[PDB]
Amino acid sequence: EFRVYSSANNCTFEYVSQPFLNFKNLREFVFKNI
Amino acid sequence: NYLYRLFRKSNLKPFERDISTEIYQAGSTPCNGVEGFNCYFPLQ
Amino acid sequence: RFASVYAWNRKRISNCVADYSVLYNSASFSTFKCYGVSPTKLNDLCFTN
C-alpha cells in the first residue's frame, strides 16, 4: 500500500535500481551525508 | 560604427591580430559566401 | 498538441546526459539565439537541472 505518504511535491531524481534476492541475514547499512 | 571581431575558431595569441574575415563556421560545412544555418558573419 | 500561451512549459528534466549538438545539427528548428553557450553547444559544460 501507500499508507506512508499522501502528498507529492516536485520530487526530482526518482530512483529504482536494486533487484532483491536463527536470524541469519544481518542487513547492515551505513547512511552518510557528506 | 565601430566593429567587433566576436567570432574566432581559436583564441587570440598575445599581441596578435585578425584582419581577414571569411564567414565564421559554426560547424555545418558549407560557408562559401553564405550565412546559411550555422555560418554567421564573424564581425558584429 | 499544446502548451498554452498564458501558461509556460517548465518541465523539470534532470539527472540525465544528452547531446545538445544532436539538436544543433538538426535543421528542423527555425532559429538559434542561444545565450548560454558562446561557441557551439553545451556538451562541454555541466549544470544543475
Burial A1-33 (b: 16+ CB within 10 A, else e): eeeeeeeeeeeeeeeeeeeeeeeeeeeeeeeee
Residue B40 β-bridge partners: B24
Burial class of residue B23, CB neighbours in 10 A (0-12, 13-18, 19+): middle
| Dihedral sign computed on CA atoms, order C23, C27, C33, C38 | positive
Question: For this experimental structure, what is the resolution in angstroms?
Answer: 3.3
Q: How far apart are CA A5 and CA A3, in angstroms?
A: 6
Q: In C, residues 19-48, which contact A (CB 8 Å cutoff)? A: none
Contact (CB<8Å) A13/C15: yes
Closest C-alpha among A11, C44, A5, C31 to residue B38 = C31
Q: From start to end of chain B, where are the E strands? A: none
Q: Is there a contact between C43 and C18 (Cβ–Cβ < 8 Å)?
A: no
Residue with cell string 540525465: C16
